[PDB]
Design a protein around this motif. Structure first.
Motif, PDB file in Angstrom:
ATOM      1  N   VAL B  43       0.830  -1.189   0.000  1.00 14.92           N
ATOM      2  CA  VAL B  43       0.000   0.000   0.000  1.00 14.92           C
ATOM      3  C   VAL B  43       0.864   1.239   0.000  1.00 14.92           C
ATOM      4  CG1 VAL B  43      -1.875  -1.177   1.136  1.00 14.92           C
ATOM      5  CG2 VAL B  43      -0.207   0.032   2.460  1.00 14.92           C
ATOM      6  N   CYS B  44       2.102   1.144   0.481  1.00  8.22           N
ATOM      7  CA  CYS B  44       2.984   2.305   0.469  1.00  8.22           C
ATOM      8  C   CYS B  44       3.376   2.677  -0.946  1.00  8.22           C
ATOM      9  CB  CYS B  44       4.228   2.028   1.294  1.00  8.22           C
ATOM     10  SG  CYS B  44       5.226   3.472   1.604  1.00  8.22           S
ATOM     11  N   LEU B  45       3.800   1.697  -1.737  1.00  2.00           N
ATOM     12  CA  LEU B  45       4.144   1.999  -3.118  1.00  2.00           C
ATOM     13  C   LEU B  45       2.907   2.275  -3.943  1.00  2.00           C
ATOM     14  CD1 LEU B  45       6.787  -0.631  -3.693  1.00  2.00           C
ATOM     15  CD2 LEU B  45       7.003   1.579  -2.673  1.00  2.00           C
ATOM     16  N   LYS B  46       1.813   1.582  -3.665  1.00  2.91           N
ATOM     17  CA  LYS B  46       0.572   1.942  -4.322  1.00  2.91           C
ATOM     18  C   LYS B  46       0.204   3.370  -3.980  1.00  2.91           C
ATOM     19  CE  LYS B  46      -1.249  -2.728  -4.335  1.00  2.91           C
ATOM     20  NZ  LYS B  46      -2.621  -3.269  -4.326  1.00  2.91           N
ATOM     21  N   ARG B  47       0.509   3.800  -2.762  1.00  2.00           N
ATOM     22  CA  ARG B  47       0.244   5.173  -2.373  1.00  2.00           C
ATOM     23  C   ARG B  47       1.110   6.139  -3.135  1.00  2.00           C
ATOM     24  NH1 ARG B  47      -3.832   7.452  -1.174  1.00  2.00           N
ATOM     25  NH2 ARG B  47      -3.269   9.053  -2.706  1.00  2.00           N
ATOM     26  N   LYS B  48       2.388   5.832  -3.268  1.00  2.00           N
ATOM     27  CA  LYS B  48       3.234   6.773  -3.974  1.00  2.00           C
ATOM     28  C   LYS B  48       2.950   6.766  -5.462  1.00  2.00           C
ATOM     29  CE  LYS B  48       6.922   6.436  -0.652  1.00  2.00           C
ATOM     30  NZ  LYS B  48       6.106   5.641   0.294  1.00  2.00           N
ATOM     31  N   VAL B  49       2.482   5.650  -6.015  1.00  2.00           N
ATOM     32  CA  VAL B  49       2.001   5.654  -7.390  1.00  2.00           C
ATOM     33  C   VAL B  49       0.714   6.456  -7.495  1.00  2.00           C
ATOM     34  CG1 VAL B  49       1.051   4.226  -9.189  1.00  2.00           C
ATOM     35  CG2 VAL B  49       3.149   3.568  -8.100  1.00  2.00           C
ATOM     36  N   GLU B 195      -3.348  -0.586 -21.467  1.00  2.00           N
ATOM     37  CA  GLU B 195      -1.913  -0.404 -21.639  1.00  2.00           C
ATOM     38  C   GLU B 195      -1.512   1.052 -21.469  1.00  2.00           C
ATOM     39  OE1 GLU B 195      -3.890  -1.796 -23.841  1.00  2.00           O
ATOM     40  OE2 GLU B 195      -3.261  -3.868 -24.200  1.00  2.00           O
ATOM     41  N   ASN B 196      -2.442   1.984 -21.671  1.00  2.00           N
ATOM     42  CA  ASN B 196      -2.162   3.374 -21.335  1.00  2.00           C
ATOM     43  C   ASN B 196      -2.052   3.555 -19.829  1.00  2.00           C
ATOM     44  OD1 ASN B 196      -1.712   6.082 -21.557  1.00  2.00           O
ATOM     45  ND2 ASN B 196      -3.778   6.615 -22.249  1.00  2.00           N
ATOM     46  N   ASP B 197      -3.019   3.021 -19.081  1.00  2.00           N
ATOM     47  CA  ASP B 197      -2.934   3.026 -17.627  1.00  2.00           C
ATOM     48  C   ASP B 197      -1.731   2.248 -17.139  1.00  2.00           C
ATOM     49  OD1 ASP B 197      -5.638   4.256 -17.546  1.00  2.00           O
ATOM     50  OD2 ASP B 197      -6.249   2.266 -18.219  1.00  2.00           O
ATOM     51  N   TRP B 202       3.978   2.267 -15.114  1.00  2.00           N
ATOM     52  CA  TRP B 202       5.422   2.082 -15.205  1.00  2.00           C
ATOM     53  C   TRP B 202       6.153   3.395 -14.985  1.00  2.00           C
ATOM     54  CZ3 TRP B 202       5.010  -2.341 -14.022  1.00  2.00           C
ATOM     55  CH2 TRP B 202       4.448  -3.365 -14.770  1.00  2.00           C
ATOM     56  N   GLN B 203       5.673   4.470 -15.607  1.00  2.00           N
ATOM     57  CA  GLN B 203       6.210   5.782 -15.293  1.00  2.00           C
ATOM     58  C   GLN B 203       6.089   6.060 -13.810  1.00  2.00           C
ATOM     59  OE1 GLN B 203       4.680   8.929 -17.669  1.00  2.00           O
ATOM     60  NE2 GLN B 203       4.818   7.789 -19.597  1.00  2.00           N
ATOM     61  N   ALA B 204       4.959   5.687 -13.219  1.00  6.17           N
ATOM     62  CA  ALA B 204       4.736   5.949 -11.811  1.00  6.17           C
ATOM     63  C   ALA B 204       5.713   5.177 -10.956  1.00  6.17           C
ATOM     64  CB  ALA B 204       3.302   5.598 -11.439  1.00  6.17           C
ATOM     65  N   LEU B 205       5.985   3.931 -11.307  1.00  8.02           N
ATOM     66  CA  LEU B 205       6.928   3.151 -10.519  1.00  8.02           C
ATOM     67  C   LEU B 205       8.330   3.719 -10.628  1.00  8.02           C
ATOM     68  CD1 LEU B 205       6.099  -0.577 -10.616  1.00  8.02           C
ATOM     69  CD2 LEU B 205       5.801   1.086  -8.834  1.00  8.02           C
ATOM     70  N   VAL B 206       8.728   4.136 -11.823  1.00 11.93           N
ATOM     71  CA  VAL B 206      10.073   4.672 -11.968  1.00 11.93           C
ATOM     72  C   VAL B 206      10.201   6.012 -11.254  1.00 11.93           C
ATOM     73  CG1 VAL B 206      11.827   5.358 -13.609  1.00 11.93           C
ATOM     74  CG2 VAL B 206      10.376   3.403 -14.083  1.00 11.93           C
ATOM     75  N   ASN B 207       9.163   6.842 -11.310  1.00  8.95           N
ATOM     76  CA  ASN B 207       9.251   8.226 -10.878  1.00  8.95           C
ATOM     77  C   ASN B 207       8.459   8.514  -9.614  1.00  8.95           C
ATOM     78  OD1 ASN B 207      10.611   8.536 -13.385  1.00  8.95           O
ATOM     79  ND2 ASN B 207       8.610   8.719 -14.374  1.00  8.95           N
ATOM     80  N   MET B 208       8.040   7.485  -8.896  1.00  7.68           N
ATOM     81  CA  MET B 208       7.203   7.627  -7.721  1.00  7.68           C
ATOM     82  C   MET B 208       7.992   8.052  -6.509  1.00  7.68           C
ATOM     83  SD  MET B 208       6.980   3.580  -6.683  1.00  7.68           S
ATOM     84  CE  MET B 208       6.007   4.066  -5.313  1.00  7.68           C
ATOM     85  N   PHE B 209       9.310   7.955  -6.571  1.00  2.00           N
ATOM     86  CA  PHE B 209      10.146   8.354  -5.458  1.00  2.00           C
ATOM     87  C   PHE B 209      10.855   9.667  -5.697  1.00  2.00           C
ATOM     88  CE2 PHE B 209      10.010   3.752  -5.190  1.00  2.00           C
ATOM     89  CZ  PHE B 209       9.446   3.647  -3.958  1.00  2.00           C
ATOM     90  N   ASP B 210      11.008  10.068  -6.954  1.00  2.00           N
ATOM     91  CA  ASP B 210      11.523  11.392  -7.237  1.00  2.00           C
ATOM     92  C   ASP B 210      10.588  12.473  -6.743  1.00  2.00           C
ATOM     93  OD1 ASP B 210      13.617  10.136  -8.544  1.00  2.00           O
ATOM     94  OD2 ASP B 210      12.562  10.187 -10.470  1.00  2.00           O
TER      95      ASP B 210
END
Lengths: 124, 283, 116, 283, 124, 124
Positions: B43-49, B195-197, B202-210
DNA sequence: TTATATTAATATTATATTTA
RNA sequence: GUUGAAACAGGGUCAGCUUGCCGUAGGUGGCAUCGCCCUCGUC
């Protein structure tokens, strides 16, 4: 635990003082104040102060050595040490300050390890 | 909807911070205790996404089922104020509400959501299921005691003028958390997760911590997103026979890690190409 | 290993509530969910809060008494367990309530301390 | 509000002094255990910024959540005495109070604030997010034992012939702490943290060590502030791939560091020119 | 309730910190911030951070101990503990995290049990 | 609990300081400020600072040792330690910071274990 | 809801390697 | 061998669906290693 080719002037002077006291303590083993007890304080810090006098004082210990070949044994390693001593430094650097005590006890070990000096001399 | 099933290994690290504080444990980072390895709830990474999508999309069809003043039954009741107010016959009213909440809320379309609550909006599983993120090595949670030269309510104010409430700042001096995740196609069919979502995810996973930075996180990064895209809606290979291809180890001679440069992430894409793609989205 | 850590949590939270009378987040409200079920996750960090709580006790003798009984509690503990079985999280709760109503007994801690 | 996402490496050294007193759990310079690298909490630098802004601005719309006389709930319940006295309907009352103390407190606009304490006034995410400053090379904390010619307490141990209270002055002989920080435009939307607030923040990081001087901390300086101004609200590139640009190493042959001249701060703005501006503000 | 031969580095460091604070709190019993109050937070987690400084700080407490033999009593068990500590670990493991608090309070009990240290010393 | 061949410069310096204070505390046992009480703070952190002076200061303790053979006993283990000390490090590493205290108390135990030094010397 | 004041505290060890 | 017999708890049913531990906070402020001590006495 002795870097015979360390070239660290503090370490070579510590080695030199270790052999100097080894000779003094083999010259007359019954000795109230060895040069550790009377000279080390400045030999570790002001090598020019004593180490001049330590070698006024050295040939006479080499004479007093009972085993006349043991005198050659110890004088040879004094020379081996002093190849690494281009000069007695005026004041031993602080690194060199500690490395003098390192040298004293490293070379003292090397002298009181049984065959080391008599061996290592025979490879020269 | 997506027509491939994905299994991704999302290696993300924390450098000096609390990746996911355990409310059960003060706020010190979640930890697999009997192995000391850190944890970061799914839920933490789902939250940051969610925070990332709420950050970037800023548009309908990608809402987030959302931040604090986010009474969820309000959004759910918004679903029942739609084309399906009455025309969807309470049985499938909740299903039409699911289809709505999936359309509007990318949170719901992507992860699921328990929205059975207000004017019941059904129960979305969510095609994207991040697992817990167990750090490769035991996080050595530092628990940096800090100070504040200020207090809160004048009940903890000092009997002298010197107010201070030192408090505690738990930081992971480094932890390379490894989150296995599953984009399940069968539930993408349920939510309309496309696939758009998915590229958004995927963008969210890569950039969810920046973008989700705190005094708590310190510095978290996304050290790698290796996505195993299966040919079938089904799985070409078992998911864990894939996740073992992304073997993340502490490097040769590190007593314990202090940066991603202390972990070797060996990716074994040697034979997965049976029918199947590995795309190194993040690393 | 669950009951004595329940007692340990009870004394720890008593010390905190004795140190800070009015607390908004006692180590119960903040550390209980994982001290009950996962003692290494917490009790390694509750007991860094502990010296500060004992320091803040206005009666330093009370700090000594509470630290004495947490020594006694923790003498029965050889290691905080990684995870507390469902058997012992019940003990932890029972141990917690036992020790916290021992602390809130009339003179129990003052007495038990004085017989050492 | 700002519109470009800054990610900055803020290198600051301590020439001889206690950079961040230390863990308070201990008081010898906050270290990373494994590496021996000194740590300086993000809150320590945030406090240097706060003190700099407090001395410099001395202004409304730039207050701080101040020093000792700093009961924060006083300053929060002060926020509930404005246009949002009560007419702001507790739901958005906390949001209006949050906006008020963003506007009023440069602290809160810049760094967050857990204001959910008094008359609850929301939590601020703090656009500017410094991380734990960790020294480039292990700080070789000297722990200088000092004395006092004066005992503090008239204790039993304030003895006859001398009142001395030896005490210890821990000091980093030198350590070039590195503070990765992130300025998030998305969370500067929520505070009104402005481009001028951010210029104040840079001016603070550069000049805040020249003013927060102390006996404990010795001489401590902003050796570099290399900001990466992303072209957009999002991340033009992953933050760590930008912080790897500011690679700080000991110089060629310095076994131990004594000054900033013992640190090659190699900086390559080669390809960030894609859309990042490497603004080398501090050095 | 003290495993004097536990060898668990967290537990031996907890014991070591317990005796360290025992000495500090016997050096000057009237003490605002004992090393529990100022060092324990990292001694339990970052033993290298403090435990170096804790033993800069230790011989001075042993001096300040009024009963000069009590200093030997406590220093002896510091050595007894430190035989089990081959190194102050950089960061205490989480198991060891908790075992440090275990050690602090186990050894603190052992010190505040009346005759234990004075006895156990006399069997050495 | 003493790794006589540890080679960890912090640990060997701790051992060295332990024997140095053992000699000082056997030179004159009635001693207000042993080198633990006056030098340990930096010997643990800045070995170059003291350990130079600690060995100006050492031969004089070896002289003051009442049992002249006990001086050889302790000097021998100083040399045994210093074989492992190629140099007094400028500043002890933090690992080495703690290992110095480890060495002090490990070697102090080894010296205050009854026959250990007199035995271990006789196997040299 | 209650409760809320200090335990323990006096010395380990201690006699010479190497020297053709 | 004339006297309570025979007898099922069955068959089976994901607890799921999912949810940031958070926002953040100076370890501070500061403190002399001091005061001082023939290397001597002499061959």
């Amino acid at each position: 635990g002795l870097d015979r080719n360390r070239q660290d002037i503090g370490y070579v002077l510590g080695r030199l003082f270790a052999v100097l006291e080894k000779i003094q303590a083999e010259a007359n083993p019954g000795l109230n104040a060895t040069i550790a007890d009377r000279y080390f304080g400045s030999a570790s810090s002001t090598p020019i102060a004593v180490f001049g006098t330590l070698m006024r004082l050295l040939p006479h210990h080499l004479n007093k050595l009972e085993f006349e070949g043991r005198a050659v044994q110890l004088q040879w390693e004094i020379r081996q040490i002093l190849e690494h001593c281009q000069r007695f430094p005026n004041h031993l650097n602080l690194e060199q300050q500690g490395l003098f005590a390192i040298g004293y006890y490293h070379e003292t070990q090397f002298l009181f390890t049984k065959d080391a000096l008599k061996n290592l001399f025979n490879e020269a | 909807t997506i027509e491939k099933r994905y299994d991704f290994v999302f290696l993300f690290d924390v450098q000096d911070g609390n990746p996911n504080g355990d409310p059960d444990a003060g706020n010190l980072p979640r930890i697999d205790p009997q192995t000391g390895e850190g944890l970061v709830t799914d839920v933490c990474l789902k939250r940051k996404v969610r925070n990332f999508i709420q950050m970037t999309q800023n548009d309908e069809h990608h809402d987030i089922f959302i931040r604090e003043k986010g009474i969820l039954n309000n959004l759910i009741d918004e679903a029942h104020e739609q084309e399906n107010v009455k025309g969807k016959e309470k049985g499938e009213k909740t299903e039409a509400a699911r289809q709505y909440m999936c359309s509007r809320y990318y949170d719901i379309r992507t992860f699921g959501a328990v929205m059975t609550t207000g004017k019941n909006a059904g129960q979305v599983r969510g095609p994207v299921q991040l697992t817990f993120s167990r750090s490769i090595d035991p996080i050595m949670t530092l628990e940096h005691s800090i100070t504040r030269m200020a207090v809160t309510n004048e009940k903890d104010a000092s009997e002298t003028g010197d107010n201070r409430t030192m408090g505690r700042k738990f930081t992971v001096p480094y932890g390379l958390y490894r989150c296995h995740g599953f984009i399940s196609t069968h539930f993408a069919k349920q939510t309309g997760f496309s696939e758009n979502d998915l590229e958004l995810f995927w963008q969210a996973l890569v950039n969810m911590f920046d973008h989700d930075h705190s005094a708590a996180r310190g510095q978290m990064n996304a050290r790698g997103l290796y996505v195993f895209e299966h040919s079938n809606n089904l799985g070409d290979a078992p998911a864990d026979s894939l996740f073992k291809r992304i073997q993340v180890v502490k490097k040769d001679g590190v007593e314990v890690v202090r940066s991603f440069d202390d972990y070797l992430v060996s990716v074994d894409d040697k034979n997965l190409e049976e029918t199947k793609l590995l795309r190194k989205l993040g690393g | 290993i669950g009951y004595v850590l329940g007692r340990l949590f009870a004394v720890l939270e008593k010390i905190q509530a004795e140190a800070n009378p009015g607390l908004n987040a006692t180590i119960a409200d903040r550390y209980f969910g994982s001290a009950s079920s996962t003692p290494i996750a917490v009790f390694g960090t509750l007991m860094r809060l502990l010296p500060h709580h004992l320091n803040k006790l206005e009666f330093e003798g009370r700090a000594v008494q509470l630290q004495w009984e947490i020594r006694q509690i923790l003498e029965h503990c050889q290691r905080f367990p990684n995870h507390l079985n469902l058997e012992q999280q019940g003990l932890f709760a029972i141990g917690y309530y036992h020790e916290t109503q021992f602390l809130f007994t009339k003179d129990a801690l003052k007495n038990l301390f004085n017989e050492a």
